Amino acid sequence: PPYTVVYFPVRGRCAALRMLLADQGQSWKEEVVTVETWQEGSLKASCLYGQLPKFQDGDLTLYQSNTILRHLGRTLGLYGKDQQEAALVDMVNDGVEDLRCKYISLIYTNYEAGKDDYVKALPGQLKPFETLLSQNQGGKTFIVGDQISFADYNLLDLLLIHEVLAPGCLDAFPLLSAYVGRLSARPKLKAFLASPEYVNLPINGNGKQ
């Protein structure tokens, strides 16, 4: 710390790290970038990959959303209890990232023509996470081990955005439905999910959801 997040005024790729910082009781500053200030290209040229989010932690600056999650994961102790759990946390996060990429492609390039097929294929894409919960203490704790990890906040966000795209998509998965319930109830996280800074931001940049 202290932290600063730089991004567009949407939830998008910053939703999971904001949930992690709020639930861990950390403070941070937000620097909002409008499409107007982004279209003038001078901030875009200073970004390593010409994209946002950008993040600061003291004198360290970082890019890439999953690198920011892994960094808070290791500096705050949200990365498993050992190397074996740290590898399982990475395997869940990479799976969450693959489906997040398919969701983003549906939202930004084919929403009207491909949402029915995307929703027809959704059960198959969520089954792996229900299976991972069934293997960890009967799905009664977290996605890996018995302590929360950064992959829990990234998987929670992906489940919450899919319920907005296909209401009831989790009805067929008992353990994922119960897991979204338990984590949404953690005190600091429940207060943050009800706040205007979270509820009043669109999920995506094109208004689709």
Ligand X SMILES: [NH3+][C@@H](CCC(=O)N[C@@H](CSCc1ccc(Br)cc1)C(=O)NCC(=O)O)C(=O)O
Q: Which amino acid is at 207?
A: G
Helix axes 111-134, 83-109, angle to 10 degrees: 160
184 is in an annotated binding site: no
3-state SS assignment for residue 28: strand
User: Least CB distance from residue 68 to a second copy, whole Å?
Assistant: 8
**x/- string (CB under 8 A) for a second copy, residues 68-107?**
--xx--xx-------xx-xxx-xx--xx--x--x------
By the rule CB under 6 A, 52 interacts with ligand X: yes
Binding ligand X (rule: CB under 6 A), the pick from 4, 26, 51, 141 is: 51
Q: Determine the Cα–Cα distance for residues 207 and 108; give it in Å rounded to an integer.
A: 10
Question: How far is it, in rounded angstroms, from Cα 209 to Cα 205?
Answer: 10
Nearest CA-CA partner of 26 in 60, 66, 58: 58
154: amino acid identity, one letter: N
* Beta carbons of 165 and 209 less than 8 angstroms apart: yes
Binding-site member from 63, 111, 192, 198 for a second copy (CB under 8 A): 63
Residue 91 interacting partner from a second copy, ligand X, none (CB closer than 5 to 8 Å by kind): a second copy
Instruction: Cite the annotated binding site for glutathione by residue number.
Output: 7, 13, 38, 44, 51-52, 64-65
Give residues in contact with a second copy (CB under 8 A).
Answer: 48-49, 60, 62-64, 66-67, 70-71, 74-75, 83-84, 86-88, 90-91, 94-95, 98, 101, 128, 131-132
